[PDB]
Amino acid sequence: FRSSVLHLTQDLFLPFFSNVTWFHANPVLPFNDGVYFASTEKSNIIRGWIFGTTLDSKTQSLLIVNNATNFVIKVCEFQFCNDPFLESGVYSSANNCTFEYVSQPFKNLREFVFKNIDGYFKIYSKHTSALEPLVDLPIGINITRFQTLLDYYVGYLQPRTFLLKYNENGTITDAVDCALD
Amino acid sequence: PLSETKCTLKSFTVEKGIYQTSNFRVQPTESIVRFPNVTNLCPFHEVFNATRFASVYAWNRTRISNCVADYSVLYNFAPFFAFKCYGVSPTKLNDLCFTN
Amino acid sequence: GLTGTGVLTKSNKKFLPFQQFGRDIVDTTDAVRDPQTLEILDITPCSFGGVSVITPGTNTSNQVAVLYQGVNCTEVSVAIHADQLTPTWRVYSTGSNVFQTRAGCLIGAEYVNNSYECDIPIGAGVCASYQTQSQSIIAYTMSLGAENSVAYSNNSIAIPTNFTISVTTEILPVSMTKTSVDCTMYICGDSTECSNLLLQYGSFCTQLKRALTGIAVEQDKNTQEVFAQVKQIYKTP
Amino acid sequence: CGDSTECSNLLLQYGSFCTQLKRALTGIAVEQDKNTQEVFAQVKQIYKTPPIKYFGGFNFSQILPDPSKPSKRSPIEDLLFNKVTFNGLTVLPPLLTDEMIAQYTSALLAGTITSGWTFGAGPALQIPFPMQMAYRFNGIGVTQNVLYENQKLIANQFNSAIGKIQDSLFSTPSALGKLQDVVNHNAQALNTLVKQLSSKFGAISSVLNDILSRLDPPEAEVQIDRLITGRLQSLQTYVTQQLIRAAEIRASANLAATKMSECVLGQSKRV
Amino acid sequence: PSALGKLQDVVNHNAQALNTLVKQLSSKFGAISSVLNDILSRLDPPEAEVQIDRLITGRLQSLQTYVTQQLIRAAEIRASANLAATKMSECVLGQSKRVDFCGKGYHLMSFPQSAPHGVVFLHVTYVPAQEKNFTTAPAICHDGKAHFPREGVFVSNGTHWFVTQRNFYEPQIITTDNTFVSGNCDVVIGIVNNTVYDP
Amino acid sequence: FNGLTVLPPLLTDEMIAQYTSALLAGTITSGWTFGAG
């Protein structure tokens, strides 16, 4: 919470004017140090994401379900038959489920940023700009790939340097990259 | 302060003027600790307030994680328990942090 | 986990629902959040500064004065009443002579409304002296001189009738001493094992010797360019 | 070290570098006051202007102090004043306030407009301003009758040239950058010195309040030594830079003191 | 006795610098001993190279600091010597017209004197005194023409008019040899009427 | 000491006194002519 100052930050950000991939409304997507996600489809049917390394109920995987009433998180070795679809409609079996969590309940954009560093899992979100932290997970799983279930975009993060600007109220207003010009 | 000036100048005589000797600082009075508060959650008395206490031949293991270990729930109940420990002290255990 | 010391007061900062503490441009903590009440509190460093002693001379008297630089005497009184001050000596405490200046608080002298010539500079246009008032130490505002009004008119002029001869002096330094260093006897000193370790650091001794030689050579030309301006020696009749 | 007793005992073995630093700073502080003393205190009498202000047509209202405003300064001085804007660091106030400097400047102006050059080499005399300018006209090779013939034109030209200075100094904010550069250079060094505290020199942490109160084993002497050396080097560099800038400050002060004596108290023939 | 403190301060600084440099030898910089002759002749194990390296670095730093201070003082002394050499050439070998350069007042002559690590100058000046008030006038008119003074200023004691120099009071009779004609009597502001003598 | 040596100056005090006496003699006997020829 800086106040009217310019801070130089070096972390994993999305480079400006980069190559993004556009889809419609399902293969395995690699997870390279975070994946950017965005969707602006009204009455979105795609609700949920899958994280894991083998995704065949042999290693502790991650699964989250989102709706308009709450947001639950279930981390276990969920067994998938051929493909997820959206209730036992996404998995078939479960074994060694010792960890479970739950979050607080509460054109339009819907952005998400995932990150797994130092044995932590945090997610940012914002609805219509800067993204605020939503919930942190102390789980220490080894995420390697990325998979969604149902007009979304996929982007990767890179260790670039940025210059952030804070106003009097303490909110980010503008930012300047350090490359491409 | 005249003796302090004489020690700073290392002499018994001193001419007229102004001399800096040392600095002054206001010392603290008391200490304050601000930690998390009443908003906590730890179910631990469930393995004490029961009837079938896991018969010896069929003992059951129960992992307890995501809790704030408070060894004061046994005193609210009957104090007939015995706090016998091996390798660990009951005094240096209250300020530790375990995982499982 | 955040440890420190200071004074905690209420501020008007409006933090965000996910902020814990605050930092300034020089990256120092100046605001925190209470995990129990969730209020905005600011941290300020406690009072500190230097101490100066004003003395008129050990051959005249043994009375001095204490000056606390950059502090208000309202806090000094509290720090003297309760044993919270670092200097354990409190001799100038039972006195009704306390004055507040723009450079701090002065204890051990009285302020007068008369102006004189500055004798011992204190600061902010305030000087002190030792007058007979029962001799004591007084503080006053320094004066710049005497006011003179020139009678300016449209047809007035002043012409002097006499004169005088004056002689003034002036002292200016010319040169200084000359020194040389070996860098070998000073560092190790009659030691062979230590001398083998100094050879790895390079040629710093050469640079030092060259600088000293240059200074020693310049000290001679300084006098040469001042006292050798003439070529012949003249004698008086 | 900072509010620490174990770290303070390790510093006593490095010698008396603090004494040298304090002596250098005290010398610089005394020199900064003597520079102003040798420039603005060249006179002993305080001369005042007469109540009536008529000097044959020369208007000095823009350089004389204005008694209406509380700050006893001239409009040009007000414009110049309006256009120019921890953990062991203390700033010492100057000896002479701004009001004393303004009084010295007003006394110099009064002695110049009422006597000219007589108050600098003896007692101050009285002489009208046109007869004073007639004698300065002879100092360059021009006869005195030219002034007695074109007094009105010369006064109009002088009043226009004085008025143009306000417009020249009001529309250009970068005209006084020389004085702002000194303030910027003095402010950047303290910020760099206070930022150097948040760095590590081969230790496990950079901040001072992270290891000076949490290190359990007493084998952290070699770790504290690195920070001690790194924080002593920064102070040495800062003192060296201050001593280097003090020489340029002294040279500028001497040049200003020479100009004040050779251009204000007389008429110079140097090109 | 404190009139020559400028020459004593340099000697005091040069004496204090060497004393500090020689006192720095009795300090330890993270070693087991401070004095040099305590470990350089008693260290049995040969694994004490760092103990000597610490002292070597600590003494090299002090040497560099001393050299830097001497370099700064040398430049200060050079500036002072240049000023002294300029004054010796301008005030002694001639009469200067620079204000407040060769004394306070109208300079006449100077005398140099030798001093230890310095030089003393004796400046002779001229200071007027005992001034009086008079009535002045820019010029005078005799036959409809303006007469300006060649050298001096027109003064009056109350009844008669005289001309004298601005540095000494010496009244003289206004004649045609002391004034020159330039212009008429209608352009000068504040002019007076008087008579001009013509031999 | 421990490697500290003070070097004597080149010109003695008697030579400086002779220079000063020559300057005084040239000033009292010639004035300003001895510096320009």
Tab-separated table of C-alpha atoms in Angstrom, chain A:
chain	number	residue	atom	x	y	z
A	1	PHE	CA	0.000	0.000	0.000
A	2	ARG	CA	2.311	2.673	-1.330
A	3	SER	CA	1.010	6.251	-1.498
A	4	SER	CA	1.847	8.503	-4.474
A	5	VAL	CA	5.148	6.919	-5.507
A	6	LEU	CA	6.557	4.921	-8.429
A	7	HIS	CA	7.769	1.439	-7.478
A	8	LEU	CA	9.920	-0.816	-9.665
A	9	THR	CA	8.770	-4.442	-9.456
A	10	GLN	CA	10.397	-7.550	-10.954
A	11	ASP	CA	8.124	-10.605	-10.957
A	12	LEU	CA	6.153	-12.905	-13.276
A	13	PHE	CA	3.915	-10.690	-15.422
A	14	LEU	CA	2.265	-10.878	-18.831
A	15	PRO	CA	4.344	-9.041	-21.470
A	16	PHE	CA	2.483	-6.310	-23.321
A	17	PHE	CA	1.603	-6.965	-26.976
A	18	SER	CA	2.169	-10.720	-26.769
A	19	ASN	CA	0.820	-13.752	-28.625
A	20	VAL	CA	-2.435	-15.096	-27.177
A	21	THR	CA	-4.496	-18.105	-28.259
A	22	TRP	CA	-8.234	-17.791	-28.921
A	23	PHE	CA	-10.620	-20.734	-28.505
A	24	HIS	CA	-14.353	-21.335	-28.950
A	25	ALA	CA	-17.233	-22.596	-26.819
A	26	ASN	CA	-10.230	-29.941	-25.504
A	27	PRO	CA	-6.570	-30.980	-25.356
A	28	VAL	CA	-4.074	-30.794	-22.510
A	29	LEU	CA	-2.403	-27.400	-22.096
A	30	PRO	CA	1.030	-27.023	-20.468
A	31	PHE	CA	1.401	-24.996	-17.271
A	32	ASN	CA	4.553	-22.880	-17.681
A	33	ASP	CA	4.923	-20.751	-14.531
A	34	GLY	CA	1.331	-19.562	-14.563
A	35	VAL	CA	-1.475	-19.317	-17.115
A	36	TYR	CA	-3.629	-16.279	-17.892
A	37	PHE	CA	-7.357	-16.874	-18.340
A	38	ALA	CA	-10.121	-14.533	-19.484
A	39	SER	CA	-13.744	-14.951	-20.557
A	40	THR	CA	-16.498	-12.436	-21.332
A	41	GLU	CA	-19.304	-14.761	-22.473
A	42	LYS	CA	-22.611	-13.864	-20.832
A	43	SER	CA	-24.225	-16.784	-18.988
A	44	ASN	CA	-20.957	-18.698	-19.032
A	45	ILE	CA	-21.265	-22.479	-19.137
A	46	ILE	CA	-17.544	-23.195	-18.609
A	47	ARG	CA	-17.220	-23.345	-14.803
A	48	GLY	CA	-14.221	-25.172	-13.347
A	49	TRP	CA	-10.560	-25.997	-13.905
A	50	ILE	CA	-8.372	-29.083	-13.506
A	51	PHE	CA	-4.766	-29.105	-12.286
A	52	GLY	CA	-2.438	-32.071	-11.957
A	53	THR	CA	0.573	-33.926	-13.292
A	54	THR	CA	-0.795	-37.277	-14.520
A	55	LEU	CA	-4.582	-36.844	-14.163
A	56	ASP	CA	-5.251	-40.583	-13.819
A	57	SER	CA	-5.886	-40.833	-10.052
A	58	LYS	CA	-2.229	-41.660	-9.338
A	59	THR	CA	-1.142	-38.286	-7.903
A	60	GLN	CA	-2.826	-35.618	-5.784
A	61	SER	CA	-4.647	-33.390	-8.289
A	62	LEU	CA	-6.660	-30.179	-7.972
A	63	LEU	CA	-10.271	-29.453	-8.910
A	64	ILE	CA	-12.417	-26.367	-8.302
A	65	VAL	CA	-16.102	-25.719	-9.028
A	66	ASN	CA	-17.526	-22.208	-9.395
A	67	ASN	CA	-21.158	-21.098	-9.467
A	68	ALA	CA	-23.286	-18.058	-8.614
A	69	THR	CA	-23.870	-19.023	-4.967
A	70	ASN	CA	-20.498	-20.125	-3.558
A	71	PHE	CA	-17.042	-21.399	-4.527
A	72	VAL	CA	-15.839	-24.811	-3.333
A	73	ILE	CA	-12.372	-26.348	-3.644
A	74	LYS	CA	-11.714	-30.103	-3.555
A	75	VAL	CA	-8.126	-31.368	-3.826
A	76	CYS	CA	-7.803	-35.143	-4.206
A	77	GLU	CA	-6.994	-37.907	-6.699
A	78	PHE	CA	-10.101	-37.610	-8.852
A	79	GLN	CA	-10.378	-40.326	-11.507
A	80	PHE	CA	-11.467	-39.141	-14.960
A	81	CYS	CA	-12.831	-41.616	-17.500
A	82	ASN	CA	-12.279	-39.936	-20.875
A	83	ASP	CA	-13.009	-36.199	-20.513
A	84	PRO	CA	-14.567	-33.870	-17.929
A	85	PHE	CA	-18.050	-32.479	-18.445
A	86	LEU	CA	-20.433	-30.311	-16.432
A	87	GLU	CA	-22.857	-34.599	-8.999
A	88	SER	CA	-20.558	-37.330	-10.336
A	89	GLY	CA	-20.425	-35.928	-13.861
A	90	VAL	CA	-16.779	-34.877	-13.786
A	91	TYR	CA	-15.103	-37.757	-11.889
A	92	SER	CA	-15.737	-41.448	-11.234
A	93	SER	CA	-13.824	-42.418	-8.073
A	94	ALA	CA	-11.908	-40.895	-5.171
A	95	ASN	CA	-9.134	-42.156	-2.906
A	96	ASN	CA	-6.941	-40.629	-0.180
A	97	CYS	CA	-8.956	-37.400	0.019
A	98	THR	CA	-7.455	-35.787	3.125
A	99	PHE	CA	-7.511	-32.104	2.090
A	100	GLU	CA	-10.558	-29.955	1.355
A	101	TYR	CA	-11.275	-26.229	1.513
A	102	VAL	CA	-14.065	-23.720	0.896
A	103	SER	CA	-14.133	-20.042	-0.051
A	104	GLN	CA	-16.325	-17.193	1.128
A	105	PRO	CA	-19.585	-16.751	-0.822
A	106	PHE	CA	-20.824	-13.557	-2.436
A	107	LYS	CA	-19.991	-6.239	-21.435
A	108	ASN	CA	-18.487	-7.914	-18.360
A	109	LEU	CA	-14.979	-9.350	-18.042
A	110	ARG	CA	-13.844	-12.305	-15.925
A	111	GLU	CA	-10.074	-12.702	-15.542
A	112	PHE	CA	-8.024	-15.259	-13.620
A	113	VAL	CA	-4.300	-15.708	-12.960
A	114	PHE	CA	-2.866	-18.883	-11.423
A	115	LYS	CA	0.539	-19.280	-9.790
A	116	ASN	CA	2.318	-22.090	-7.923
A	117	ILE	CA	5.501	-21.007	-6.122
A	118	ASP	CA	7.022	-21.915	-2.737
A	119	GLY	CA	4.408	-24.597	-2.123
A	120	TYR	CA	1.530	-22.108	-2.337
A	121	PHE	CA	-1.375	-21.704	-4.756
A	122	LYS	CA	-2.990	-18.280	-5.162
A	123	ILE	CA	-5.538	-16.971	-7.661
A	124	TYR	CA	-6.404	-13.414	-8.715
A	125	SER	CA	-9.741	-12.220	-10.069
A	126	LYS	CA	-11.610	-9.055	-11.026
A	127	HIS	CA	-14.985	-8.393	-12.658
A	128	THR	CA	-16.006	-5.347	-14.685
A	129	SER	CA	-7.622	-2.597	-14.252
A	130	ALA	CA	-5.616	-4.467	-11.613
A	131	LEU	CA	-6.248	-7.945	-10.214
A	132	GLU	CA	-6.639	-8.440	-6.451
A	133	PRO	CA	-5.805	-11.632	-4.532
A	134	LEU	CA	-8.809	-13.853	-3.831
A	135	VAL	CA	-7.706	-16.921	-1.839
A	136	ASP	CA	-4.411	-18.640	-1.043
A	137	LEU	CA	-4.025	-22.406	-0.673
A	138	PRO	CA	-1.195	-23.957	1.400
A	139	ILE	CA	-1.398	-27.178	-0.645
A	140	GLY	CA	1.920	-28.468	-1.951
A	141	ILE	CA	0.917	-30.459	-5.033
A	142	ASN	CA	3.134	-30.602	-8.140
A	143	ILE	CA	1.165	-29.020	-10.984
A	144	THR	CA	2.548	-29.712	-14.462
A	145	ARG	CA	-0.325	-29.349	-16.959
A	146	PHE	CA	-3.563	-27.379	-17.273
A	147	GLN	CA	-7.061	-28.499	-18.241
A	148	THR	CA	-10.474	-26.822	-18.320
A	149	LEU	CA	-14.028	-28.153	-18.389
A	150	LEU	CA	-17.357	-26.835	-19.645
A	151	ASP	CA	-14.465	-18.113	-26.015
A	152	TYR	CA	-11.564	-18.223	-23.554
A	153	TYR	CA	-7.962	-17.062	-23.880
A	154	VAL	CA	-4.712	-18.650	-22.692
A	155	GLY	CA	-1.526	-16.723	-21.973
A	156	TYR	CA	1.789	-17.448	-20.292
A	157	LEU	CA	3.748	-15.309	-17.837
A	158	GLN	CA	7.392	-14.257	-18.102
A	159	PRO	CA	9.859	-12.653	-15.636
A	160	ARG	CA	9.694	-9.052	-16.849
A	161	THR	CA	10.307	-5.755	-15.059
A	162	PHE	CA	7.476	-3.238	-14.666
A	163	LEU	CA	6.984	0.214	-13.147
A	164	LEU	CA	3.790	0.640	-11.124
A	165	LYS	CA	2.055	3.905	-10.223
A	166	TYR	CA	0.014	4.433	-7.052
A	167	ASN	CA	-2.454	7.253	-6.430
A	168	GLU	CA	-3.458	8.825	-3.109
A	169	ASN	CA	-6.050	6.139	-2.328
A	170	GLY	CA	-3.445	3.418	-2.907
A	171	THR	CA	-4.632	1.830	-6.163
A	172	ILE	CA	-2.660	0.993	-9.296
A	173	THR	CA	-3.498	3.404	-12.124
A	174	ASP	CA	-0.911	2.889	-14.885
A	175	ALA	CA	2.067	0.673	-15.678
A	176	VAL	CA	5.019	0.793	-18.077
A	177	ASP	CA	6.959	-2.189	-19.416
A	178	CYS	CA	10.743	-2.266	-19.906
A	179	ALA	CA	11.014	-3.748	-23.411
A	180	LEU	CA	9.693	-3.566	-26.994
A	181	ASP	CA	10.612	0.141	-27.155
